């Protein structure tokens, strides 16, 4: 399967380098603008502000790894060592699953604000949103920890080793883990956003829009960008239970920067929470 190995090498060296390079540029400019916009324009933060700021810190953590990942793919090997293998492997998964969770909590915030504009409920308080943000980081750190435990079992001390559980290790355990992570990390938050879109539509039908705009954009962005990646990560593991195996790995490679395009386009949500932040940004 020499031809498929040529495709794998080209996809890593040229496709991943270019796609991650573009995401690094668009992501850094977008996230620094919305972060400095909050640091210099927002005086009194609400729940949605807290979640959006966390989403940007999550994006920026991922964007900071990209020069190392692009340099590794461009040279064909991992040379940064064991500490940087674990920190990079953590940040990539953590950015993926914290991002959909921050958007799920923003969606519930927009729904409660639609019913109770004055934010009287404890669930609608800024201090509670800070607690939920800390909960999101702890939950996602825990979801990602079995992958890190597997990585510490491999010979990372060699300095040039940094395995992907989709491609290495027991396929039976990797599949159970990857399917549980697809369910808890992707499908469950996506369903919760779908449920709250439906609750919003029912509320507005009874009373008979901006709240619908943010939730619909979140459901569309995550359905389109996370679905090919989640299908291929699971198909890559299942195929390990040949040329078919290398072809599936090439399809899997293609889907990875497509899922992380999320971190470059996420700053758009800053402009969908009704505060006229775009107008506030131009004034400064």
């Amino acid at each position: 399967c020499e031809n498929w190995l040529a495709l794998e090498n080209i996809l890593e060296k040229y496709y991943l380098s270019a796609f991650y390079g573009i995401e690094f540029i668009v992501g850094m400019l977008g996230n620094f603008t919305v972060v400095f916009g909050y640091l210099f324009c927002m005086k009194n933060w609400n729940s949605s502000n807290v979640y959006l700021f966390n989403l940007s810190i999550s994006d920026l953590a991922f964007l900071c790894t990209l020069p190392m990942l692009i340099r590794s793919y461009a040279t064909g090997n991992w040379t940064y060592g064991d500490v940087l293998c674990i920190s990079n492997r953590y940040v990539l998964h953590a950015n993926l699953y914290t991002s959909i969770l921050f958007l799920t909590f923003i969606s519930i915030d927009r729904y409660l604000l639609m019913k109770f504009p004055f934010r009287e409920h404890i669930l609608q308080k800024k201090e509670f949103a800070i607690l939920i943000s800390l909960a999101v980081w702890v939950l996602v750190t825990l979801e990602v920890l079995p992958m890190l435990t597997f990585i510490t079992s491999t010979p990372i001390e060699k300095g040039d080793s940094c395995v992907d559980y989709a491609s290495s290790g027991n396929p039976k355990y990797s599949l159970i883990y990857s399917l549980c992570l697809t369910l808890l990390g992707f499908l469950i938050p996506l369903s919760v956003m779908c449920f709250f879109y439906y609750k919003m539509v029912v509320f507005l039908k009874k009373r008979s829009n901006k709240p619908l705009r943010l939730v619909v954009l979140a459901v569309v962005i995550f359905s389109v960008l996370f679905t090919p990646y989640h299908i291929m990560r699971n198909v890559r593991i299942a195929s390990r239970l040949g040329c078919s195996q290398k072809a599936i790995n090439c399809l899997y490679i293609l889907t990875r920067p497509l899922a992380f395009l999320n971190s470059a386009v996420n700053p758009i949500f800053y402009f969908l929470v009704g505060d006229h932040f775009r107008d506030m940004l131009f004034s400064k």
Partner: nanobody
Amino acid sequence: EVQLVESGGGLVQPGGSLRLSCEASGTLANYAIGWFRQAPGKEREGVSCISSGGSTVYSESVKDRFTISRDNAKKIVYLQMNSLQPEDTAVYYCAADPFGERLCIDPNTFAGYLETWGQGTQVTVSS
């Protein structure tokens, strides 16, 4: 470019009614007007809000008792307060948002972005 003045503050017996006015000097058509109140030792809280389109919102504590209305021709916003109780004793203020459809989405957060406020009017509910 608008200036606000609240008026109508007075002494009400528990269960009594009172109407406040928020009068503007400057057009008011494109402004959202929210009513806020501050009791001694407590934080400021929104009570009622009217968008430039005419949509009204009420806090849960005043929902069954207050009515907000506007007269763009006279540039006045009224707050009819029915069934007032000692716990409603506070200085009532009105604020104006030039983004007419913004304020009433999240009055307690979006009030913080506003430069146009009145001086406040004292409402005292005591037996």
